[PDB]
Amino acid sequence: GSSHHHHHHSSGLVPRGSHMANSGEAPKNFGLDVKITGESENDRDLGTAPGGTLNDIGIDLRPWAFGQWGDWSAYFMGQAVAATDTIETDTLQGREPDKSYLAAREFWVDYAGLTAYPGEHLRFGRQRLREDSGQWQDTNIEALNWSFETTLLNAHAGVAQRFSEYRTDLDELAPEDKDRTHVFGDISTQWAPHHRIGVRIHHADDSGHLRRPGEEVDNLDKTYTGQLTWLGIEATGDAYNYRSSMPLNYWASATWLTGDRDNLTTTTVDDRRIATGKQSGDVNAFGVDLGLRWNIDEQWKAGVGYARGSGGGKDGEEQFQQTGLESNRSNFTGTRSRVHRFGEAFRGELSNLQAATLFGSWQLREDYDASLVYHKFWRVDDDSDIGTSGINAALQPGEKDIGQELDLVVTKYFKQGLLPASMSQYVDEPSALIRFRGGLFKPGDAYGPGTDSTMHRAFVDFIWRF
Ligand SMILES: CCCCCCC/C=C\CCCCCC(=O)OC[C@@H](O)CO
Ligand SMILES: CCCCCCC/C=C\CCCCCC(=O)OC[C@@H](O)CO
Ligand SMILES: CCCCCCC/C=C\CCCCCC(=O)OC[C@@H](O)CO
Ligand SMILES: CCCCCCC/C=C\CCCCCC(=O)OC[C@H](O)CO
Ligand SMILES: CCCCCCC/C=C\CCCCCC(=O)OC[C@H](O)CO
Ligand SMILES: CCCCCCC/C=C\CCCCCC(=O)OC[C@H](O)CO
Ligand SMILES: CCCCCCC/C=C\CCCCCC(=O)OC[C@H](O)CO
Ligand SMILES: CCCCCCCCCCCC[N+](C)(C)[O-]
Ligand SMILES: [Ca+2]
Ligand SMILES: [Ca+2]
């Protein structure tokens, strides 16, 4: 069920001989996830800077261990990566990564005895946190998190904070993560079969300090401290369920962001960046995300989406931002494969950003899936920047047109052997997959002259679970 240690993994693979493969088998006490990835990326800066190009290959080995004793259980997953350059082998992301490294990915203890519900448990340690949209949390982080998942009622509550990367190559935390504590919760109900309504809350509190006036500031220093609360409502009808039987699936969510930020101000003095003070101000921002998916027949689906995170406003009060724990990856095209909601290439954060999206998808049982996604992006306020994105180039003042993107994701799932056999029958539950995942980004007028006319980021992933 939902407490299984691989429940949230996007791959959805089942090892041969596991209890999930055959309910007569005992739960596995250990296993190995193997990933081989190639990445082609050109060019993250749109040709405005040296570097920013990848054409490289890597292997990622993820052994794991699991123990269960009554209501207690424990889990560890490690990671070893070797690659020809610093590629992305992990969609979930002294800050220079090495080509090769070791990591402690997950380590937690879990207690399920507070209630008799198997859907209820308490988990403590570095753990996968995820909700279905991927827009609030989808990350491995140190946390204490309570989950309650039953037919009529779902609820969660937890607290989380990064203390290390637990990596051999990254010495320090990203500044936004340093001394930031997250508290969060959600409650939702299935008010009709396959229709869910819920509320969600998240609070992020920065206990750090900003550099004082006259101090040099570098990439490891914070740009702001905040106390931010997100309050959201969400309605879904099989939004992220690739096995829906309904002719139509939908999601609608609205989120208010309130609180305050202390923003560091700086000036450049002799190749240096020097702190000049700080400015505080309230945040009163809003985000929405809507989508509708047509289940045309057993194999074909298509749909449309719209999202907007506010931007600008009086002294930047209307600049929406996400929690910083999000992936923005979800099953919104209606397939077993998760897709970046705002482009594999652009990788937009919902922040001073408006996006319109169209997709079509195709799937065949548990054996194949494919999605084609089109996005158009605009700035909401053409003098404010946007949030994070997979594009590292300056925006020109006064231009709303961010660009357009076309994404393709194609996946083959299989079981027996290293690679599929053409004589193999349709797989009941696959243990391995091969995937192409690619995005083509066409910059719009906001990127100005001297930039490339197109950018791409594409991956081939081979994944095996043993
Ligand atoms: C707060 C962080 C918690 C970190 C806990 C990490 C635990 C790592 C791996 C889980 C395996 C626990 C040991 C299993 C064991 O010794 O015996 C059980 C197993 O061999 C048969 O049931
Ligand atoms: C096993 C049951 C655990 C019960 C503990 C419940 C923990 C308490 C609240 C969880 C919901 C998140 C609350 C968010 C919050 O407190 O911040 C809101 C505040 O910042 C508004 O200004
Ligand atoms: C209808 C297809 C829309 C989605 C297209 C996404 C695929 C993006 C690129 C194609 C993958 C090939 C990657 C290799 C490549 O393009 O050449 C390397 C590059 O540096 C110069 O082209
Ligand atoms: C039931 C007890 C079993 C204990 C399992 C230990 C697993 C073995 C090694 C995991 C290493 C844990 C990560 C430690 C670590 O990386 O610390 C990082 C430092 O703080 C510097 O970043
Ligand atoms: C094929 C083996 C796969 C198993 C890999 C498990 C690796 C377990 C723990 C490695 C993480 C330990 C990090 C230790 C460390 O020194 O990190 C801190 C560095 O000094 C960065 O400043
Ligand atoms: C970039 C990918 C292409 C995006 C396509 C987006 C299209 C949005 C919605 C498609 C609606 C599908 C309607 C299907 C339909 O009407 O079939 C009717 C049949 O005749 C029923 O018998
Ligand atoms: C580019 C590197 C390899 C990437 C592999 C990604 C997935 C590969 C192939 C998917 C092919 C999709 C067409 C499937 C199809 O037409 O039907 C399959 C048959 O019905 C069953 O054999
Ligand atoms: C679809 C994108 C994945 C294909 C890219 C494969 C790259 C193989 C070349 C590895 C050599 C890299 N290099 C030149 C730095 O050594
Ligand atoms: Ca470049
Ligand atoms: Ca329980």
XYZ file of C-alpha atoms and ligand atoms in Angstrom:
638
model
C 0.000 0.000 0.000
C 0.841 3.674 0.428
C 3.384 2.884 3.130
C 5.555 0.737 0.856
C 9.052 2.199 0.641
C 8.880 2.521 -3.180
C 5.261 3.724 -3.270
C 6.139 7.242 -4.432
C 8.767 6.304 -7.029
C 7.851 7.478 -10.507
C 9.153 4.320 -12.190
C 6.342 2.113 -10.865
C 8.434 -1.028 -11.358
C 8.050 -4.258 -9.380
C 11.037 -6.576 -8.769
C 10.620 -10.216 -9.693
C 9.926 -12.421 -6.679
C 8.689 -9.514 -4.539
C 5.559 -9.479 -2.407
C 4.190 -6.820 -4.736
C 4.802 -9.135 -7.702
C 3.142 -12.142 -6.015
C 1.257 -11.825 -2.735
C 2.442 -15.300 -1.680
C 6.059 -14.096 -1.426
C 7.557 -12.561 1.673
C 8.394 -8.832 1.551
C 11.915 -8.327 0.235
C 14.513 -7.340 2.801
C 16.808 -5.840 0.166
C 17.039 -5.000 -3.494
C 18.940 -2.998 -6.042
C 17.760 -0.299 -8.431
C 20.022 0.186 -11.456
C 19.866 3.223 -13.738
C 21.858 3.939 -16.883
C 21.261 7.414 -18.323
C 22.463 9.493 -21.233
C 21.813 13.240 -21.319
C 22.098 15.693 -24.210
C 21.637 19.333 -23.233
C 22.354 22.313 -25.494
C 22.419 25.090 -24.410
C 21.180 26.011 -20.910
C 22.321 29.627 -21.320
C 20.994 29.959 -24.902
C 24.540 30.483 -26.146
C 25.231 33.549 -23.997
C 28.057 31.981 -21.943
C 30.773 29.339 -22.339
C 29.773 25.870 -21.269
C 26.213 24.796 -20.625
C 26.428 21.764 -22.935
C 26.102 18.089 -22.037
C 26.477 14.942 -24.162
C 27.266 12.337 -21.575
C 26.421 9.005 -19.996
C 26.271 7.677 -16.463
C 25.326 4.788 -14.219
C 23.531 5.044 -10.878
C 23.304 2.112 -8.440
C 20.800 2.322 -5.584
C 20.937 -0.605 -3.151
C 18.338 -0.649 -0.429
C 17.517 -2.537 2.744
C 14.218 -2.946 4.578
C 13.263 -4.507 7.893
C 9.906 -5.025 9.551
C 9.100 -6.120 13.125
C 5.483 -5.785 14.180
C 4.474 -2.156 13.861
C 8.099 -1.013 13.437
C 10.001 -0.892 10.175
C 13.231 0.643 8.908
C 14.644 1.492 5.496
C 17.948 2.558 3.964
C 18.745 3.455 0.364
C 22.200 4.447 -0.827
C 23.423 5.766 -4.148
C 26.575 5.422 -6.230
C 26.956 7.424 -9.445
C 29.704 7.369 -12.079
C 29.309 9.543 -15.166
C 31.374 11.076 -17.961
C 30.138 14.541 -16.894
C 27.804 15.955 -14.242
C 24.498 14.741 -15.692
C 21.104 14.474 -13.974
C 20.662 10.872 -12.886
C 18.081 11.929 -10.254
C 15.003 13.976 -11.176
C 14.771 14.956 -7.489
C 18.073 16.880 -7.890
C 30.964 23.874 -1.854
C 28.156 23.194 -4.344
C 30.174 21.813 -7.267
C 29.071 18.212 -7.953
C 31.630 15.585 -8.959
C 31.222 13.294 -11.959
C 31.229 10.353 -9.521
C 29.932 10.295 -5.952
C 28.274 8.352 -3.139
C 25.133 9.406 -1.271
C 22.831 8.297 1.532
C 19.510 8.756 -0.236
C 16.930 7.575 2.310
C 17.203 6.380 5.896
C 14.203 6.187 8.177
C 12.331 4.317 10.895
C 8.562 3.992 10.736
C 5.935 3.210 13.361
C 2.484 2.057 12.285
C 0.948 1.292 15.693
C -0.801 4.588 16.532
C -3.991 3.267 14.849
C -5.229 -0.040 13.471
C -5.371 1.369 9.920
C -2.601 -0.001 7.666
C -2.918 3.276 5.764
C -1.744 5.151 8.881
C 1.902 5.356 9.933
C 4.548 7.728 11.273
C 7.919 8.016 9.510
C 11.104 9.611 10.912
C 14.307 10.189 8.940
C 15.431 11.152 5.453
C 12.459 10.025 3.419
C 10.561 10.542 0.214
C 7.827 13.143 0.682
C 5.377 13.447 -2.194
C 1.879 14.592 -3.007
C 0.164 13.780 -6.268
C 0.618 17.105 -8.041
C 4.322 17.274 -7.226
C 3.816 21.036 -6.839
C 4.135 21.175 -3.034
C 6.468 18.309 -2.149
C 8.335 15.670 -4.103
C 11.789 15.267 -2.604
C 13.965 13.235 -0.235
C 14.334 15.244 2.984
C 14.860 14.698 6.708
C 11.388 14.765 8.192
C 8.919 13.515 10.721
C 5.771 12.843 8.734
C 2.408 11.354 9.718
C 0.226 9.817 6.995
C -3.401 8.670 7.164
C -4.869 7.202 3.966
C -8.286 5.461 3.946
C -11.234 5.246 1.560
C -13.097 8.339 2.738
C -10.391 10.427 4.428
C -6.746 11.245 3.749
C -4.634 13.395 6.048
C -0.942 14.160 6.509
C 1.116 16.307 8.864
C 4.846 16.702 9.140
C 7.933 18.811 9.689
C 11.104 18.791 7.598
C 14.500 20.467 7.368
C 17.686 19.854 5.403
C 20.814 19.418 7.498
C 23.142 17.927 4.859
C 23.190 16.614 1.309
C 24.697 13.325 2.635
C 26.883 13.300 -0.485
C 30.598 12.805 -0.969
C 30.878 15.782 -3.353
C 28.572 18.512 -1.961
C 30.013 20.079 1.212
C 27.292 22.626 1.920
C 23.565 23.189 1.628
C 22.002 25.441 -0.963
C 21.405 28.831 0.716
C 17.627 28.602 0.403
C 17.698 25.301 2.345
C 20.075 26.414 5.103
C 18.186 26.910 8.400
C 14.779 26.641 6.658
C 12.159 24.653 8.579
C 9.014 23.365 6.846
C 5.736 22.479 8.578
C 2.876 21.157 6.499
C -0.394 19.272 6.462
C -3.385 18.297 4.388
C -6.848 16.774 4.695
C -9.038 15.573 1.860
C -12.050 13.380 1.264
C -13.469 11.362 -1.603
C -16.866 13.063 -1.748
C -17.933 10.955 -4.756
C -16.210 7.891 -6.237
C -12.911 9.095 -7.774
C -13.647 12.774 -6.952
C -11.558 14.292 -4.174
C -11.627 17.691 -2.485
C -9.049 18.845 0.011
C -7.189 21.639 1.729
C -3.442 21.896 2.118
C -1.147 24.058 4.214
C 2.592 24.610 4.158
C 4.763 26.954 6.241
C 8.443 27.715 5.645
C 10.445 29.654 8.228
C 13.997 30.948 7.710
C 16.046 31.164 10.900
C 19.184 32.217 9.038
C 20.805 35.618 8.890
C 21.570 37.812 5.912
C 25.001 39.267 5.302
C 25.528 42.628 7.010
C 26.204 45.850 5.061
C 29.724 45.940 3.702
C 30.237 42.173 3.795
C 31.054 40.370 0.580
C 28.253 38.133 -0.640
C 28.775 35.032 -2.771
C 26.670 32.178 -4.193
C 26.542 30.396 -0.806
C 24.883 33.343 0.978
C 21.129 33.752 1.353
C 19.275 36.298 -0.765
C 16.355 36.540 1.662
C 14.833 35.213 4.848
C 11.114 34.591 5.007
C 8.183 33.287 6.950
C 5.779 32.124 4.270
C 2.470 30.253 4.500
C 0.751 28.589 1.563
C -2.970 27.822 1.992
C -4.500 25.809 -0.813
C -7.682 24.113 -1.955
C -7.561 21.291 -4.499
C -10.223 19.343 -6.381
C -9.311 16.304 -8.483
C -11.167 13.692 -10.488
C -8.614 10.936 -11.193
C -6.234 13.775 -12.090
C -3.110 11.633 -11.859
C -4.634 8.158 -12.269
C -3.427 6.504 -15.474
C -5.987 3.699 -14.939
C -9.103 5.913 -14.860
C -12.353 4.514 -16.247
C -14.067 7.942 -16.361
C -14.426 9.670 -19.746
C -13.054 12.911 -18.231
C -10.433 13.613 -15.572
C -9.621 17.015 -14.073
C -7.641 18.984 -11.539
C -8.230 22.448 -10.131
C -6.213 24.061 -7.384
C -5.904 27.535 -5.948
C -3.247 28.591 -3.483
C -2.793 31.769 -1.459
C 0.726 32.661 -0.354
C 1.063 35.051 2.589
C 3.789 36.092 4.958
C 6.856 38.302 4.802
C 10.341 38.332 3.288
C 13.500 40.256 4.248
C 15.295 40.745 0.919
C 19.045 41.299 0.843
C 20.224 44.229 -1.247
C 23.681 44.262 -2.837
C 25.902 46.342 -5.085
C 28.852 45.401 -7.275
C 32.160 46.970 -6.218
C 35.387 45.980 -8.013
C 34.378 42.529 -9.321
C 32.827 41.895 -5.887
C 29.205 41.785 -4.783
C 28.791 43.719 -1.512
C 25.797 43.775 0.831
C 24.104 47.144 1.244
C 21.252 46.360 3.608
C 17.865 44.684 3.414
C 14.224 45.501 2.728
C 11.255 43.711 4.285
C 7.787 43.482 2.871
C 4.623 41.424 3.061
C 3.799 38.736 0.522
C 0.192 38.449 -0.747
C 0.337 36.238 -3.844
C -1.812 33.682 -5.610
C -1.371 30.596 -7.771
C -3.822 28.500 -9.766
C -3.493 25.294 -11.798
C -6.292 23.750 -13.855
C -6.436 20.820 -16.217
C -8.883 18.671 -18.126
C -8.056 15.306 -19.687
C -10.191 13.420 -22.216
C -9.977 9.613 -21.973
C -10.834 9.084 -25.617
C -10.583 5.295 -25.564
C -8.581 2.575 -23.834
C -5.321 3.807 -25.352
C -5.655 7.497 -26.305
C -5.930 10.567 -24.070
C -5.636 14.299 -24.666
C -6.045 17.373 -22.582
C -5.406 21.009 -21.790
C -3.965 22.884 -18.855
C -3.603 26.399 -17.542
C -1.504 27.646 -14.657
C -0.600 31.050 -13.302
C 1.600 32.165 -10.433
C 1.186 35.856 -9.716
C 4.097 38.232 -10.111
C 5.158 41.759 -9.292
C 2.716 43.925 -7.358
C 3.413 46.709 -4.880
C 6.996 46.169 -3.655
C 6.899 42.618 -5.026
C 4.110 41.492 -2.693
C 2.359 39.591 -5.501
C 5.345 37.426 -6.458
C 4.192 33.858 -5.978
C 6.788 31.161 -5.322
C 6.669 27.469 -4.573
C 7.763 25.697 -1.393
C 11.203 24.700 -2.668
C 10.383 21.040 -1.988
C 8.453 20.584 -5.229
C 9.395 18.678 -8.372
C 6.476 19.821 -10.551
C 6.521 16.289 -12.020
C 3.208 14.449 -12.193
C 1.188 11.923 -14.184
C -0.910 14.727 -15.689
C -0.881 13.254 -19.213
C -2.672 10.161 -17.904
C 0.170 7.623 -18.272
C 2.429 5.591 -15.976
C 5.228 8.076 -16.829
C 5.586 11.299 -14.857
C 6.175 14.432 -16.930
C 7.435 17.858 -15.882
C 4.314 20.012 -15.631
C 6.166 23.047 -17.025
C 8.499 21.423 -19.542
C 11.435 19.008 -19.484
C 13.512 21.819 -21.006
C 12.073 24.973 -19.411
C 11.395 23.292 -16.030
C 9.361 26.275 -14.911
C 8.528 27.136 -11.325
C 5.102 28.741 -10.844
C 6.421 32.217 -10.110
C 5.452 35.315 -12.145
C 4.561 32.762 -14.803
C 1.498 32.010 -16.925
C 1.413 28.739 -18.869
C -0.968 27.175 -21.389
C -0.455 23.497 -22.180
C -1.835 20.902 -24.613
C -1.022 17.224 -24.524
C -1.830 13.945 -26.163
C -0.913 10.553 -24.823
C -1.069 6.902 -25.778
C -0.622 3.771 -23.746
C -0.989 0.039 -24.185
C -1.721 -1.978 -21.016
C 1.429 -1.878 -18.822
C 3.780 -2.269 -21.803
C 4.088 1.155 -23.472
C 3.276 4.785 -22.989
C 3.948 7.968 -24.899
C 3.111 11.632 -24.342
C 3.470 14.751 -26.495
C 3.143 18.049 -24.645
C 3.088 21.626 -25.916
C 3.563 24.636 -23.612
C 3.445 28.393 -24.109
C 4.883 30.557 -21.325
C 4.389 34.222 -20.429
C 5.571 36.451 -17.635
C 2.807 37.979 -15.547
C 4.753 41.138 -14.681
C 7.276 42.037 -17.368
C 9.619 43.931 -15.011
C 9.907 41.122 -12.437
C 11.988 38.038 -12.902
C 10.575 34.551 -12.871
C 11.511 31.816 -10.407
C 13.786 28.892 -11.018
C 13.928 27.340 -14.458
C 16.108 25.104 -16.606
C 17.141 28.133 -18.690
C 20.049 30.274 -17.450
C 19.726 33.516 -19.393
C 18.659 37.033 -18.492
C 15.130 38.240 -19.217
C 14.773 41.559 -21.034
C 12.721 44.235 -19.222
C 9.247 44.876 -20.563
C 8.799 41.613 -22.523
C 6.143 39.050 -21.553
C 6.927 36.350 -24.168
C 9.011 33.676 -22.426
C 8.741 31.074 -25.178
C 7.234 27.769 -26.263
C 8.190 24.166 -25.705
C 7.453 20.732 -27.194
C 8.123 17.626 -25.053
C 8.091 13.940 -25.973
C 8.223 11.069 -23.481
C 8.135 7.456 -24.749
C 8.471 4.430 -22.468
C 8.724 0.670 -22.896
C 8.152 -1.461 -19.779
C 9.305 -5.070 -19.476
C 10.183 -7.863 -17.058
C 12.346 -10.863 -17.927
C 15.971 -10.317 -18.824
C 18.162 -7.294 -19.369
C 16.257 -6.009 -22.428
C 12.787 -6.925 -23.743
C 12.260 -9.868 -26.061
C 10.064 -9.394 -29.113
C 8.536 -12.827 -28.429
C 7.676 -11.783 -24.860
C 4.022 -11.624 -23.865
C 2.462 -8.452 -22.474
C 3.948 -7.843 -19.034
C 1.733 -8.168 -15.961
C 3.975 -6.022 -13.739
C 7.216 -4.804 -15.318
C 10.536 -4.776 -13.476
C 12.468 -2.636 -15.964
C 11.897 0.189 -18.400
C 13.595 2.088 -21.199
C 12.542 5.685 -21.734
C 13.193 8.649 -23.978
C 12.368 11.955 -22.308
C 13.026 15.150 -24.252
C 12.089 18.774 -24.538
C 12.605 21.427 -27.206
C 12.404 25.039 -25.981
C 12.003 28.000 -28.332
C 12.869 31.247 -26.492
C 10.511 34.145 -26.990
C 11.115 37.864 -27.080
C 11.900 38.064 -23.353
C 15.328 36.539 -24.034
C 16.346 39.225 -26.514
C 18.982 39.282 -29.243
C 22.102 37.150 -29.304
C 20.450 34.010 -27.902
C 20.018 30.638 -29.579
C 16.767 30.163 -31.455
C 16.208 26.770 -29.798
C 17.421 24.796 -26.804
C 16.947 21.138 -25.951
C 17.403 18.758 -23.052
C 16.908 15.042 -23.713
C 17.485 11.863 -21.723
C 17.539 8.161 -22.371
C 17.028 6.187 -19.148
C 17.365 2.424 -18.637
C 16.017 1.415 -15.213
C 16.043 -2.066 -13.656
C 14.702 -3.132 -10.273
C 16.069 -6.323 -8.660
C 16.335 8.166 12.128
C 17.099 7.468 11.006
C 16.762 5.986 11.012
C 17.770 5.231 10.143
C 17.433 3.745 10.124
C 18.216 3.047 9.008
C 17.962 1.542 9.062
C 18.706 0.870 7.914
C 18.300 -0.264 7.355
C 17.046 -1.012 7.798
C 17.431 -2.429 8.227
C 17.306 -2.565 9.740
C 18.097 -3.780 10.226
C 17.390 -5.082 9.844
C 17.887 -6.201 10.760
O 18.888 -6.056 11.370
O 17.185 -7.402 10.904
C 15.962 -7.458 10.227
C 16.146 -8.310 8.983
O 17.488 -8.724 8.922
C 15.181 -9.488 9.072
O 13.926 -8.995 9.466
C 0.328 11.841 14.867
C -0.531 13.098 14.767
C 0.386 14.320 14.725
C -0.422 15.579 15.032
C 0.501 16.793 14.996
C -0.108 17.888 14.124
C 0.950 18.954 13.835
C 0.300 20.337 13.791
C -0.059 20.902 12.653
C 0.157 20.220 11.302
C -0.476 21.050 10.185
C 0.509 22.101 9.668
C 0.306 23.415 10.419
C 0.958 24.578 9.679
C 1.219 25.689 10.694
O 1.113 25.437 11.847
O 1.600 26.980 10.286
C 0.563 27.897 10.055
C 1.035 29.299 10.454
O 2.327 29.538 9.968
C 0.086 30.378 9.929
O 0.603 31.644 10.253
C 8.197 15.835 -32.161
C 9.391 15.795 -31.204
C 9.288 16.928 -30.180
C 10.171 16.643 -28.963
C 11.643 16.734 -29.364
C 12.540 16.517 -28.147
C 13.823 15.819 -28.602
C 15.009 16.781 -28.587
C 16.123 16.482 -29.234
C 16.248 15.172 -30.016
C 17.126 14.167 -29.269
C 18.489 14.061 -29.953
C 19.567 14.692 -29.073
C 20.886 14.791 -29.843
C 20.943 16.117 -30.600
O 19.952 16.748 -30.754
O 22.150 16.600 -31.121
C 23.052 17.117 -30.177
C 22.976 18.648 -30.145
O 24.091 19.169 -29.470
C 22.909 19.219 -31.563
O 21.712 18.821 -32.180
C 20.223 0.175 12.303
C 21.547 0.934 12.256
C 22.148 0.802 10.860
C 22.857 2.098 10.492
C 22.856 2.244 8.972
C 24.056 3.090 8.556
C 24.225 3.022 7.043
C 25.687 3.291 6.700
C 26.075 4.457 6.221
C 25.069 5.581 5.989
C 25.768 6.933 6.123
C 24.789 7.977 6.656
C 25.157 9.339 6.067
C 26.215 10.032 6.923
C 26.685 11.304 6.217
O 26.783 11.320 5.032
O 27.005 12.451 6.953
C 27.441 13.517 6.156
C 28.282 14.479 6.991
O 27.475 15.132 7.928
C 28.932 15.518 6.081
O 28.030 15.899 5.079
C 27.607 0.733 -5.030
C 27.533 1.220 -3.582
C 26.231 1.990 -3.344
C 26.081 2.311 -1.855
C 26.389 3.777 -1.583
C 26.072 4.101 -0.124
C 26.892 5.303 0.330
C 26.608 5.590 1.804
C 27.108 6.669 2.373
C 27.968 7.627 1.551
C 27.674 9.077 1.946
C 28.727 9.493 2.960
C 29.117 10.955 2.780
C 30.353 11.145 3.658
C 30.998 12.494 3.398
O 32.115 12.703 3.747
O 30.275 13.497 2.762
C 30.721 14.770 3.140
C 31.781 15.268 2.167
O 32.952 15.602 2.872
C 31.217 16.511 1.505
O 31.727 17.618 2.199
C 0.351 18.734 -28.608
C -0.478 17.458 -28.436
C -1.856 17.607 -29.086
C -2.857 18.231 -28.099
C -4.303 17.794 -28.378
C -5.271 18.510 -27.421
C -6.724 18.169 -27.755
C -7.664 18.466 -26.578
C -8.761 17.735 -26.388
C -9.118 16.564 -27.312
C -10.594 16.170 -27.249
C -10.779 14.776 -27.832
C -12.176 14.564 -28.417
C -12.297 13.114 -28.878
C -13.668 12.877 -29.495
O -14.423 13.782 -29.566
O -14.049 11.614 -29.977
C -15.418 11.492 -30.268
C -15.674 10.086 -30.806
O -16.266 10.159 -32.073
C -16.607 9.321 -29.868
O -17.317 8.370 -30.614
C 15.743 5.959 -28.319
C 16.325 4.963 -27.320
C 15.265 3.918 -26.996
C 14.050 4.583 -26.352
C 12.970 3.522 -26.150
C 11.663 4.184 -25.732
C 10.490 3.246 -26.020
C 10.768 2.471 -27.313
C 9.847 2.139 -28.203
C 8.371 2.496 -28.061
C 7.677 2.120 -29.368
C 6.216 2.573 -29.347
C 5.417 1.836 -30.426
C 4.747 0.619 -29.794
C 3.767 -0.027 -30.769
O 3.617 0.432 -31.852
O 3.031 -1.156 -30.388
C 3.781 -2.186 -29.813
C 3.080 -3.525 -30.040
O 1.693 -3.348 -29.976
C 3.521 -4.544 -28.993
O 4.643 -5.226 -29.478
C 19.709 11.279 -25.904
C 20.924 11.864 -25.186
C 21.908 10.817 -24.673
C 23.025 10.522 -25.669
C 24.387 11.084 -25.256
C 25.452 9.992 -25.170
C 26.836 10.585 -24.931
C 27.954 9.582 -25.184
C 29.311 10.277 -25.289
C 30.117 10.161 -23.996
C 31.439 10.922 -24.087
C 31.327 12.272 -23.382
N 32.639 12.899 -23.383
C 32.916 13.414 -24.733
C 32.678 14.022 -22.431
O 33.514 12.062 -23.061
Ca 26.692 28.367 -23.052
Ca -1.364 2.080 11.489
